[PDB]
């Protein structure tokens, strides 16, 4: 809280954090895409897709 209840210290620090977390999200999306690029995506048939691929 920064005090005894929800007050001026709380609102001012919540805006500083609302600015920061989106840039952390952008960093975890890259880690998300890096782990996908290992084996590639899946398909609705649930079987291997190595026999037919398109760019």
Q: Is 39 annotated as a binding residue?
A: no
- Cα within 13 Å of Cα(52), Cβ side: 3
37 is in an annotated binding site: yes
CA-only gyration radius of the chain, Å = 21
Cα gap 26→15, rounded to integer Å: 18
User: Which residues define the annotated binding site?
Assistant: 18, 32, 37
User: Which residues define the annotated binding site for heme b?
Assistant: 18, 32
User: Which residues define the annotated binding site for a ubiquinone?
Assistant: 37
């Amino acid at each position: 809280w920064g005090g005894f209840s929800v007050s001026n210290p709380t609102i001012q620090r919540f805006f500083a954090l609302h600015y920061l977390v989106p840039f952390i999200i952008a960093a975890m999306v890259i880690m998300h895409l890096m782990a996908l690029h290992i084996h590639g995506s899946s398909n609705p048939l649930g079987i291997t897709g190595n026999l037919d691929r398109i760019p």
